């Protein structure tokens, strides 16, 4: 027929922004589950790169377009709020653009599917939350078995028995059976090589990768210690503009060495003024961070030095201990001074690695940290990584208490409901819902497609024993087949589910509302 | 008088691009809401407009939809004077380049 | 040396390339002609946007390199300088007689015959000229203020002004009786200084009668005023360009201390000459100080206490426009100042402005003075400055009817005058220079033509109906629908223009068009 | 393997003589259109992007500086005739240009160029006899000094902006020409300076120099303005303090110094201010800034000061007052100081300008020029020119030929006479130099619109008659007899024109090669 | 001809038809900023590094050049509104590109 | 300033109809008079031929613009009503056109 002629053309840029973010979710998608196929990168170095973890992927990626760069951060949004499903949340929004490309061809406005699309995710939440195996933190069996599950995916499984509990006593001791935000950050996974998977420790002050002192002279052990965090260098002067010393024999010599003695002495004694006990040094190049000369005179202080400390160790001992920065040994005073009970150097298979206990100070905050152990830098970083994920895992029960089963199932659970509730809608209600509804499956179905089954067969299996059935029904690829995943402990948190269907209908709403690109210069 | 005629329609026209753009950007048929929108007004009834969430015609009064009369008085007077500013303009003369 | 990469151009086809170059010039500007001219945009050098209709500005920041071109530029100039109105119009009728030329060359007529014969029509149309005109400073000195404030807000009409221009009418005035004393009758423009800053609306721009500081005190607790005090002789004012304290450098001191005795010295040394130099403004009988330099805090503490207001950090100009404004001197030093040196005034005080934080410092005499500076507002930069140079224009044609009382009606008529005449005259020749007669009064028609085309109206009805009005009914003046107005007849409209302008537009314009019709040959070598 | 030139230029034959010529005839038709008191105006932008307007012959010719390498001698020979007579430049081109462009063709029939040359060498003596032969020795004859000399200039002025106001500048040419020393007149002596404002008949004639008043600054004005005996200094130096332009840092060894240096600058202006009153200068000049302290000063010692005085006026200051100028104040003795009958301030151009009057030293003059725009006083000072050389050289030689090509016509007349009994290839060339003269009565009539076709056949005719004075009359359309009309100028312009346009002929026509050097 | 060293000349059909179209490329910016339903603007400067969006108006007029010189006046007319008045940025740009449009 | 565009440019046709017919006018014109100049023509057959009769110039010249060819059935008319001035006629013509 005759219609608007379309001269001016704004959809050229809407289908260049969902063909574009569209080819980064179907890139992903095939990676999806644990039988996935793996991805291989060439990097800007040259490395050769090869990984199926859907946020490691997509940072290399190396997307390009402004709009299609979007997706990169809904996998950030996702590992930062739940830290699972950051592979899943770019699947569905690729399913659900492609929902809306077939919207927009069928004469929607992208403003109606925008906003339908949204009306969709609140209804898919509930649907969600109502399906869920609740849990309780008061039942520290089942935290440990829902950590296990996610433990039972990882290179040494062996050990699990002790990473569960280790996760799940991390977070008690900070997070009672009433509190709705958990953030991990306040959980420090410390690695030391030495040791092995099982010989861990929870340490309430501090674990640091450091060693204290080995000269002669030092303390290495203080009882009832005030901490300083050193953010300047202790050495003798040494500018960096023009100078010269000249020395022309062992008397001249003696009286440099005074002056710069005599420098680190006066730094040294207001430390001691100040009442404080160890020195807590923060990692830099540019000068010594405590010189030998200064250990001498802090030695003879009983003083205790911890050099070369990680910016990430400094922030967590800032809020552990109770204790604050002194940016120079001029404001190096008792007020910015926490407390210990104990501050001492353990030597564990060669460990020698510093921590403290027993802070007991009002300005400490319910942090913990977690001594790893291992022979091979892989056990470490396996154990630092499996702690981590098993974290996550407990930090969104919290936030949404209860699991659902995982193969895909409350995707279509939500997808089946969905697709017969919308029947009972009007106009665009109904024709949208049916392609929401519709666009969730890419989950059940890539899953059966990369475990090696026929899609439609799994899918059609999926949609009739749910009808039948319940949300633990649903793809197991250990199975190979529909089964029974509650009973396979196939379990995700709720928080996963949740926010894939939050974070699916943000981005679709972002992509979708852009109309054009404009540079600013 | 005659040839300012076509120029005062002109300026009604202009004003009433705002609802169009309004029904247009809320995914509504603008065309259909702006021309029934326009006989309510014209017959008597000078209390309905747009309901950019239903897409319909409604009840300004009803709904609550109101905005500043001194705001109303500077859109109008600033975009009759942004006009005149470029209106007077027919030539572009540049000097050399710095 | 280095003839080549030269550009050259000669003979019968210079003569039309040379036309055709001021024809492109007029191109231009014309559109401007008239109080409803459109606006150009002016791109400057930086990028920078500006819009006005002023030809003197367009062609000043027009930059060519078009030889005839700038002979045009070089006639806006003085056109500019001299009478300050007719900046456009002798332009586009230089360019109207270059026109009328091409085709009396293109018929056989020499460039020369034609320069004779232009020139004699100039005189024939400013001897009828004279016929038309009367006086306005003539009889009762009310209608000369009633007319010479109506001339004002008519000049102002083409701008931006126009909107509240009753008020900037009144300034143009009163600045142009205020420096100007009734026997003597001349005007010396640079006694007018404009001035404006950015905000509020340009209603609220006045005339001021003294001088303005865009300076504020050289300490916040500083009074900010002095009064006459209760009869004494009004307000001494301390002009200088040196603070009044022991000098300090911004870069190095070089100052070597040989002893510990002239150490202690030295630091009282530099204690006790802030004290002896504010004390030598209490000598001098001084109220306040107005120097180039600020001041230290120290001298600011003891004007303080002795109740001598200070303004910091007031430039050049401003330091004169006290002294010339007070009769007094600016005086380098100290030493020198006592009753014969500092200003006098009646009142000094600070002005605020509604919401404006600026603040100005205001010296008045309180009494007639000679020198004025209009103080222009309005709501942004652009708005300021149009309103600031349409003073600029009113008060050169405030300054020409001071100076000279004739006056002729405008609005074309004069034009169309002279034309009817040099048209009339033209028959009478029986010779060749009736060609040159003829295009003369034909080049004149061009700008009642132009004010209709710019105004919306049809040129060949509108120059019909202007000449057969002045044929038909009475020679009396009759102008051109271009304001809008009920009808035409400008006798009772009050769109005057001096006699001397439109006397200096017609003779100027006609010598241009001789300046370029006499080139036979351009030489063009390059730009070092 | 070997070349003989590696981008080593010569060019040979016939052809380069004739290549030659064309090059020669271009810089004729850029300067033909200058001959005559209607002569065309010429636009030339040089380097250094300033615009100059004239239709003086050697003002533009050497702003072309033609840089073909034949073409160059016309320059050269211009320039002989602007140091040996003053005058005449156009003519020399011109008439040099058409008796090259009439030995093109004599080389295209295979004269030689010898032939030519040895031809127009016997012409031009034959043509110089005749042009002593009509030339006048007449001073007062039946007139008086002023009389002669105001109908020059008047002459020289007709048809010009400033015709119906002659009365007035014929007047100050004049007067210029006859203040100035009677055994050497140098037009250098005769200033003009431009004021814009007033009418052209308003000019004003000073016998000292005047100056551009300079001062904006406030406390300005407040000197004595007249003096009836002043004594005259002029300085190198500034008289100034503080100016509003520059500035100065304050460097002490003692902190009680800070304020002296301020007061200390003041002393060493006030005591340059002191060593000038020990001179006992009345009106002090400077060519850079005097400021308010030595206003100050100088005015409450009953001097008058005016400084950023143009260089050129300053060295006619001393011209006029017949002092020396000096750069320092310590070393002054009053035999530097100049005397004036006058010091006053003008109103011409409706501006205060000051200027001496009266100077009893002076071998100057300065003439101001008023008008309603700067291109009129132009041509005010353009037809001031030629009325003071007119006036110049009417008072400085006696022995005149007619102009208006009232001689060429003759000498034209006389080589063709010659002609009838110059027998071979002399008989060609012979009559080519005599049509080489009718370009000059030729150009002038087209130059004034004339119809030249009709006015040179008359003018044939009425020599042909004997009537030897008539030329082109610039009036009327018609002939009449110029020396009656006193449309003087000097013999020698015309037999210095006459052998130096030859002699340019003959050196471009005698070269058959051009080598040139690149690289 | 006149003019020269590269300057931008344009005469009444010219510059008549830029003044309109720069006006209508302003009005382009904001026409899809106006009401609660309106369309984002994805703005991105060379550096790559500062991508954002938004449908603010006047964020949007600020921050995008436009090189068309009666463009500029526009624009800068916006400012003013937005600056001063704090509303109607978008409707006075828009009313004024419909304004200019039709003329 | 700015006045009606007229997208659509049949001024075009009226230029190029006035510049053709005046082009014909101006050639035949320097034929006029008893002192007029004759002219040269070389036809489509090879034939040339030299002659100053204003109508055998038009009927030779080989006219193809549509418009300017009514110059020709001008000099028709001429010399069928009054048999002479069939030179002046289109002179006329072309400085009417030329008005």
Redesign the interface.
């Known amino acids: 027929n005759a219609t608007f002629k379309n001269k001016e053309k704004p959809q050229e840029v809407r289908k260049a922004n969902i063909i574009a973010a569209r080819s980064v979710a179907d890139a992903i998608r095939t990676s999806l589950g644990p039988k996935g196929m793996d991805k291989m990168i060439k990097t800007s170095r040259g490395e050769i790169i090869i990984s199926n973890d859907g946020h490691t992927i997509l940072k290399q990626m190396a997307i390009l377009h402004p709009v299609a760069r979007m997706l990169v951060e809904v996998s950030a949004a996702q590992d930062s709020e739940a830290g699972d499903g950051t592979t899943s949340v770019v699947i569905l929004t690729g399913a659900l653009l492609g929902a809306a490309e077939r919207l927009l061809n069928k004469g929607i406005h992208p403003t109606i599917i925008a906003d339908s699309f949204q009306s969709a995710a609140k209804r898919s939440v509930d649907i969600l939350l109502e399906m869920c195996h609740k849990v309780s933190l008061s039942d520290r069996e089942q935290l440990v078995r829902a950590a296990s599950t996610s433990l039972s995916s990882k290179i040494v499984s062996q050990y699990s028995s002790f990473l569960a509990p280790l996760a799940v006593d991390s977070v008690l001791k900070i997070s009672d059976e009433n509190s709705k935000n958990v953030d991990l950050n306040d959980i420090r996974l410390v690695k030391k090589v030495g040791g092995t998977i099982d010989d861990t420790e929870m340490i309430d002050g501090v674990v640091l990768t450091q060693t204290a002192i080995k000269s002669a002279g030092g303390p290495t052990r203080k009882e009832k210690a005030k901490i300083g965090l050193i953010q300047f260098q202790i050495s003798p002067p040494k500018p960096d503009t023009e100078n010269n010393i000249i020395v022309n024999d062992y008397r001249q010599m003696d009286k440099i060495l005074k002056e710069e003695r005599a420098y680190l002495l006066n730094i040294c004694k207001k430390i001691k003024k100040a009442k404080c006990n160890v020195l807590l040094i923060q990692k830099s190049i540019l000068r010594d961070a405590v010189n030998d000369l200064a250990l001498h005179f802090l030695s003879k202080l009983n003083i205790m030095v911890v050099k070369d400390i990680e910016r990430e160790e400094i922030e967590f001992l800032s809020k552990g201990l109770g204790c604050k920065p002194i940016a120079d040994i001029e404001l190096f005073t008792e007020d910015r001074l926490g407390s210990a009970d104990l501050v001492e150097e353990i030597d564990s298979d060669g460990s020698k690695i510093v921590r403290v206990t027993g802070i007991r100070n009002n300005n400490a905050r319910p942090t913990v940290s977690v001594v790893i152990r291992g022979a091979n830098n892989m056990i470490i970083d396996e154990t630092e990584r499996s702690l981590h994920d098993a974290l996550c895992v407990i930090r969104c029960l919290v936030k949404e208490r209860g699991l659902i089963a995982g193969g895909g199932a409350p995707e279509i659970e939500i997808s089946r409901r969905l697709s017969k509730e919308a029947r009972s809608m009007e106009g665009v209600q109904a024709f949208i819902w049916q392609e929401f509804a519709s666009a969730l499956e890419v989950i059940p179905t890539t899953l059966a497609e990369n475990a090696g089954l026929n899609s439609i067969k799994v899918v059609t299996e999926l949609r009739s024993k749910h009808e039948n059935g319940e949300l633990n029904d649903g793809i197991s690829v250990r199975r190979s087949g529909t089964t029974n995943t509650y009973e396979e402990h196939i379990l995700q948190p709720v928080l996963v589910s949740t926010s894939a269907i939050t974070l699916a209908s943000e981005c679709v709403k972002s992509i979708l509302r852009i109309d054009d690109i404009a540079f600013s210069r | 008088d005659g040839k300012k005629s076509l120029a005062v329609e002109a300026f009604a026209r202009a004003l009433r691009q705002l609802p169009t753009i309004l029904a247009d950007n809320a995914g509504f048929d603008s065309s259909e809401l702006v021309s029934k929108l326009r006989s309510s007004i014209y017959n008597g009834i000078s209390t309905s407009g747009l309901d950019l969430n239903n897409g319909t015609i409604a009840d300004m009064r009803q709904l609550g939809i109101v905005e500043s009369y001194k705001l109303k008085r500077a859109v109008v007077s600033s975009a009759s004077e942004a006009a005149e500013v470029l209106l007077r303009v027919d030539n572009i003369i540049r000097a050399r380049p710095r | 040396?280095?003839?080549?990469n030269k550009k050259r151009q000669?003979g019968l086809e210079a003569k039309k390339s040379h036309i055709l170059?001021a024809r492109?010039?007029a191109?231009?500007i014309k559109?401007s002609l008239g109080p409803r001219g459109?606006?150009?945009?002016?791109?400057?050098?930086?990028?920078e946007?500006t819009?006005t209709?002023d030809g003197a500005t367009?062609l000043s920041?027009?930059?060519?390199?078009?030889?005839?071109?700038?002979?045009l530029v070089?006639?806006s100039k003085?056109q500019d300088?001299?009478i300050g109105d007719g900046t456009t119009g002798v332009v586009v009728l230089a360019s109207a007689l270059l026109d009328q030329a091409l085709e009396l060359i293109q018929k056989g007529i020499?460039?020369?015959?034609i320069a004779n014969g232009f020139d004699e029509a100039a005189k024939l149309a400013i001897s009828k000229l004279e016929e038309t005109c009367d006086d306005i400073s003539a009889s009762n000195d009310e209608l000369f203020r009633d007319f010479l404030l109506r001339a004002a807000k008519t000049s102002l009409g083409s701008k931006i002004v126009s909107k509240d221009h009753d008020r900037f009418a009144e300034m143009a005035v009163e600045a142009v009786i205020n420096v100007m004393d009734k026997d003597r009758k001349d005007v010396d423009f640079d006694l007018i200084k404009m001035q404006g800053r950015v905000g509020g609306s340009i209603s609220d721009s006045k005339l001021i009668n003294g001088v303005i500081l865009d300076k504020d005190f050289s300490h916040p607790q500083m009074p900010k005023c002095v009064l006459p005090k209760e009869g004494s002789d009004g307000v001494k004012l301390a002009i200088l360009?040196?603070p009044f304290e022991?000098?300090?450098?911004?870069?190095?001191?070089?100052?070597?201390i040989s002893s510990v005795e002239?150490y202690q010295k030295?630091?009282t040394?530099?204690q006790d000459?802030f004290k002896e130099?504010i004390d030598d403004v209490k000598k001098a009988g001084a109220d306040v100080v107005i120097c180039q330099w600020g001041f230290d805090d120290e001298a600011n503490h003891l004007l303080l206490q002795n109740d001598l207001p200070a303004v910091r950090w007031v430039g050049?100009q401003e330091?004169?426009?006290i002294?010339?404004s007070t009769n007094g001197?600016?005086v380098?030093?100290?030493?020198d100042l006592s009753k014969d040196k500092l200003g006098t005034c009646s009142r000094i005080y600070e002005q605020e402005f509604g919401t404006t934080k600026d603040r100005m410092l205001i010296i008045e005499q309180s009494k007639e003075t000679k020198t004025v500076t209009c103080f222009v507002r309005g709501?942004?930069k652009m708005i300021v400055d149009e309103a600031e140079r349409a003073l600029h224009d009113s008060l050169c044609v405030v300054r020409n009817l001071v100076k000279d009382s004739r006056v002729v009606y405008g609005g074309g008529a004069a034009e169309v005058t002279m034309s009817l005449a040099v048209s009339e005259e033209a028959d009478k020749q029986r010779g060749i220079d009736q060609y040159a007669f003829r295009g003369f009064a034909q080049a004149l028609d061009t700008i009642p033509m132009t004010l209709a085309?710019?105004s919306?109206l049809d040129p060949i009805g509108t120059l019909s109906t202007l000449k057969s009005k002045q044929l038909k009914e009475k020679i009396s003046n009759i102008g051109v629908d271009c304001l809008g107005y009920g009808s035409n007849d400008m006798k009772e409209l009050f769109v005057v223009d001096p006699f001397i302008g439109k006397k200096?537009q017609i003779?100027?314009a006609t010598?241009?068009c001789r300046?370029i019709l006499?080139?036979?040959?351009?030489?063009?070598?390059?730009?070092? | 393997i070997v070349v003989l030139k590696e981008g080593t230029d010569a060019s040979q034959g016939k052809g380069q003589i004739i290549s030659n010529i064309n090059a020669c005839v271009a810089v004729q038709e850029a300067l033909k259109p200058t001959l005559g008191p209607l002569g065309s105006d010429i636009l030339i932008v040089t380097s250094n992007q300033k615009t100059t307007i004239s239709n003086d012959g050697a003002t533009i010719l050497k702003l072309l500086d033609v840089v073909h390498p034949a073409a160059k001698t016309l320059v050269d020979i211009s320039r002989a005739q602007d140091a040996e007579v003053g005058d005449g430049t156009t003519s020399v081109t011109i008439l040099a240009g058409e008796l090259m462009k009439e030995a093109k063709p004599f080389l295209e029939e295979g004269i030689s160029s010898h032939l030519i040359m040895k031809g127009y060498r016997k012409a031009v003596s034959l043509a110089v006899e005749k042009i002593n032969e009509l030339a006048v020795d007449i001073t007062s004859e039946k007139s008086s000094g002023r009389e002669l000399l105001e109908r020059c200039a008047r002459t020289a002025m007709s048809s010009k902006l400033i015709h119906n106001n002659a009365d007035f500048f014929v007047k100050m040419c004049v007067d210029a020409v006859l203040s100035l020393d009677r055994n050497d007149l140098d037009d250098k002596l005769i200033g003009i300076k431009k004021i814009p404002g007033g009418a052209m008949e308003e000019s004003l004639f000073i016998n000292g120099v005047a100056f551009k008043k300079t001062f904006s600054y406030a406390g300005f004005e407040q000197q004595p303005k007249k003096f009836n005996n002043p004594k005259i200094l002029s300085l190198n130096v500034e008289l100034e303090l503080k100016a509003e332009k520059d500035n100065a840092e304050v460097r002490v060894e003692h902190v009680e110094d800070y304020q002296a240096i301020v007061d200390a600058e003041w002393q060493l202006i006030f005591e340059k201010l002191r060593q000038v009153e020990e001179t006992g200068a009345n009106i002090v000049l400077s060519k850079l800034p005097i400021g308010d302290l030595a206003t100050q000063f100088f005015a409450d010692r009953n001097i008058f000061c005016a400084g950023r005085v143009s260089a050129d006026d300053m060295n006619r200051v001393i011209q006029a007052v017949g002092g020396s100028i000096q750069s320092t104040t310590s070393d002054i003795k009053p035999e530097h100081l100049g005397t004036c009958a006058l010091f006053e301030e003008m109103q011409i151009g409706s501006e205060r300008y000051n200027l001496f009057q009266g100077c009893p030293q002076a071998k100057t003059c300065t003439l101001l020029l008023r008008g309603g725009a700067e291109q009129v006083i132009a041509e005010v000072e353009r037809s001031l020119h030629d009325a003071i050389m007119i006036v110049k050289r009417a008072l400085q030689n006696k022995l005149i030929v007619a102009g208006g090509g009232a001689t060429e016509m003759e000498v034209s007349k006389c080589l063709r006479d010659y002609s009838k009994t110059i027998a071979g290839k002399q008989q060609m060339i012979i009559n080519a130099f005599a049509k080489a003269l009718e370009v000059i009565p030729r150009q002038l009539c087209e130059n004034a619109g004339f119809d030249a076709i009709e006015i040179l056949n008359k003018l044939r005719l009425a020599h042909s008659k004997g009537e030897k004075w008539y030329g082109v009359v610039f009036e009327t359309e018609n002939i009449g007899d110029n020396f009656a009309k006193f449309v003087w100028e000097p013999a020698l312009v015309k037999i210095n024109a006459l052998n130096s346009a030859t002699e340019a002929t003959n050196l471009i026509l005698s070269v058959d090669e051009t080598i040139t050097n690149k690289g | 001809q006149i003019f020269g060293d590269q300057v931008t000349e344009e005469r009444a059909e010219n510059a008549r038809l830029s003044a309109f179209v720069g006006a209508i490329a302003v009005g382009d910016l904001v026409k899809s900023t106006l009401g609660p339903k309106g369309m984002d603007k994805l703005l991105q400067s060379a550096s790559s590094n500062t991508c954002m969006v938004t449908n603010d108006g006047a964020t949007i007029l600020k921050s995008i050049p436009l090189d068309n010189p009666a463009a500029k006046v526009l624009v800068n007319i916006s400012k003013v509104q937005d600056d001063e008045v704090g509303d109607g940025t978008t409707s006075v740009t828009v009313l004024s590109a419909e304004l200019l449009r039709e003329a």
């Open positions: 040396k280095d003839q080549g000669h170059a492109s010039v191109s231009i559109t459109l606006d150009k945009i002016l791109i400057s050098p930086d990028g946007i819009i209709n367009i920041q027009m930059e060519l390199d078009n030889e005839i071109a700038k002979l070089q006639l003085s300088d001299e020499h460039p020369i015959k360009t040196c022991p000098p300090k450098p911004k870069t190095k001191h070089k100052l070597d002239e030295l630091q040394y530099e000459k130099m050049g330091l004169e426009h002294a010339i001197r600016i380098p030093r100290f030493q709501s942004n085309e710019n919306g200096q003779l100027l010598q241009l300046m006499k080139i036979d040959n351009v030489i063009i070598s390059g730009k070092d």
